[PDB]
């Protein structure tokens, strides 16, 4: 019914955290991901050895830099996370372009979308979120969607499970309509706010939730276990 879940931790202590993740027996099917800054990438890669985990880069937008990461053995990347948009100035189209370059360079990509508090209050959740994803889809081919993962982050405190499902359902309906129902069915849509052990498990029960993009904290263990 659901595709393979993903549990991803986004860096923004570390040694002790890696030791914990390494000692953790994971008894179900789930791709774990640790996303890391450049300066911490080499340490994480040498210390993290759990075979159900992969290392991810963050925010690379240059082709040579993409090439070096691959050559170094990094195959995943996270792009378009909320602060890149609201602080750093990365427009829908800048994020779209980074996503397409990463795909052409042989990356699996977690691409982030989400609306602000004011967008949500004024009832513009759907137009904003779907405008973000349309910008990404414009630079991809259908076959590229095998390499893409979507994280929904409510930039506005956890979303109720119903609030989170509404937003996930809206995304999957647009993907099914615009890209194909085969693509929609296989796509991982991760929940990107909010998450602790307890609420994670409850959120995972929703029909259109396929995992989490969460913080690099000890509680990540519990969010991995929540993906069933």
UniProtKB/Swiss-Prot annotation:
Keywords: Gluconeogenesis, Glycolysis, Glycosome, Isomerase, Peroxisome. The keyword Ubl conjugation does not apply. Gene3D superfamilies: Aldolase class I. It comes from the Eukaryota. SUPFAM superfamilies: Triosephosphate isomerase (TIM). Belongs to the triosephosphate isomerase family. This is Triosephosphate isomerase, glycosomal.
